[PDB]
Description:
The chain has 66 residues and is mainly β. It has one domain. It has no helices and 4 strands. Residues 1-66 form the Disintegrin domain. Inhibits platelet aggregation induced by ADP, thrombin, platelet-activating factor and collagen. Acts by inhibiting fibrinogen interaction with platelet receptors alpha-IIb/beta-3 (ITGA2B/ITGB3).
Amino acid sequence: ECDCSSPENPCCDAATCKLRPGAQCGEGLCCEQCKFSRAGKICRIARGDWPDDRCTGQSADCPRYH
């Protein structure tokens, strides 16, 4: 299980396909520049006036209110 899909991705070690030391993530709706997105950053639009999903600060995945 690689953490990045492309060897062009600077978040991973070219030699391992896994995160470089200190990188929190390589991919995901709540990853930016190899770091978890800040808590509260919008990461998925909900239909209508339902609350949009937001990042946790602690994961690269966008959690669900639905």
